[PDB]
Amino acid sequence: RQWALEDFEIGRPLGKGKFGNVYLAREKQSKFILALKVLFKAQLEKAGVEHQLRREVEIQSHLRHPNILRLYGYFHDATRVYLILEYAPLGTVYRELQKLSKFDEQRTATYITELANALSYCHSKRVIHRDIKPENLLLGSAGELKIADFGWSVHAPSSRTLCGTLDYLPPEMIEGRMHDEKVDLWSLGVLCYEFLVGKPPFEANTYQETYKRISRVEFTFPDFVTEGARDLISRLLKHNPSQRPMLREVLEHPWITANSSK
Numbered sequence: 001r002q003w004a005l006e007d008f009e010i011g012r013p014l015g016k017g018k019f020g021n022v023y024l025a026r027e028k029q030s031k032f033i034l035a036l037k038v039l040f041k042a043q044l045e046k047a048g049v050e051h052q053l054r055r056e057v058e059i060q061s062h063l064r065h066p067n068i069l070r071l072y073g074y075f076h077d078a079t080r081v082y083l084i085l086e087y088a089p090l091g092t093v094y095r096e097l098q099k100l101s102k103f104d105e106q107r108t109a110t111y112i113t114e115l116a117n118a119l120s121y122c123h124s125k126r127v128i129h130r131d132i133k134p135e136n137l138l139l140g141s142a143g144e145l146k147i148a149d150f151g152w153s154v155h156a157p158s159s160r161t162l163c164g165t166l167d168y169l170p171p172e173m174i175e176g177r178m179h180d181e182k183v184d185l186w187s188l189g190v191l192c193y194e195f196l197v198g199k200p201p202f203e204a205n206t207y208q209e210t211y212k213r214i215s216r217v218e219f220t221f222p223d224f225v226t227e228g229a230r231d232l233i234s235r236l237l238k239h240n241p242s243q244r245p246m247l248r249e250v251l252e253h254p255w256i257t258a259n260s261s262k
C-alpha cells in the first residue's frame with residue numbers, strides 16, 4: 001500500500017534523529033500504534049546519504065527477528081522521508097543506563113545474549129550493523145532488547161562516509177581500513193564493558209585522544225568487574241579482527257551462561 005502522512009495521527013516525539021525526529025504515531029484505519037522516523041530530504045541530500053537511507057530501508061525491511069526492530073514500510077513527500085517503524089515502548093538501553101548508572105551481571109549478560117542472537121541472524125545474511133551503541137538498542141513491551149537504526153548497515157565486506165563519536169568503532173573503521181562482520185563483535189565487547197562499568201572502555205574528552213586509545217586498545221577494568229566478565233570482554237576487544245570470537249562462542253561463554261536469563 002502507498003502510504004501518506006494523512007494516514008497517521010502523530011503523537012509525542014520519541015527521539016531526535018540526525019535528520020529530524022521520531023514520533024509515536026497511530027495509523028487511522030487500524031488504530032495501529034507505531035513510530036515515524038522523519039528525515040528532511042534537504043539534509044539527506046546535503047550529506048549525500050540517500051544510499052544509506054536506501055540501505056537502511058532495504059536491509060531492515062527484510063529482517064525478521066524478535067530482537068531486531070521491525071521496519072514496516074516507508075513513504076515521503078515534497079519535503080521529507082518517513083520511515084514506518086515498530087514502536088519500542090520501553091525506550092533505549094541508553095536511558096536505562098543513565099537511570100541505573102550501570103547494570104548487574106544478570107541484566108548485562110541477558111542483553112548480550114539477545115544482541116548476539118540478533119547479530120548472528122544479521123551475520124547469517126552477511127549484514128553488518130556497524131552502529132551498535134546504547135541509543136540504538138530499544139526495549140520491547142516485555143523489556144526485551146531490539147537492535148534498531150540500520151542507517152549504517154552494509155553487506156560485508158566493506159570500506160568507508162564521515163563520523164561522530166568513536167566510542168564504539170573498531171580500529172579497522174577509525175583507520176578507514178576494510179572491514180567485515182567482525183566490527184559488530186568489537187562493539188558488543190564495548191557494550192558489555194559499558195553496561196557493567198557505566199561508561200565505554202575508551203572514553204575520553206578528546207576525539208584525538210579516543211582515537212589513540214581505540215587504536216592502541218587501551219582499557220583497564222574497575223575492581224568490581226568479575227574475572228568472568230573480564231575474560232569475555234578481553235576476547236571481544238582484540239585489535240586483530242580475526243582474533244575476535246564468533247557469536248556462537250559468545251552465546252556459549254561460561255560467564256554468559258551463568259548469568260543470562262534468555
Ligand SMILES: Nc1ncnc2c1ncn2[C@@H]1O[C@H](COP(=O)(O)OP(=O)(O)NP(=O)(O)O)[C@@H](O)[C@H]1O
Pocket residue numbers: 014015016017018019020022035037069085086087088089091092135136138148149151
Ligand atoms: N521505534 C522507536 N521507538 C521508540 N523510540 C525510537 C524508535 N526509533 C527511534 N527512537 C528514538 O529516536 C532516537 C533516534 O532514532 P534513530 O533511529 O537512532 O535516528 P538516527 O537519525 O539514525 N540517529 P542515530 O541512532 O545516532 O544514528 C533513538 O535515540 C531513540 O531514543
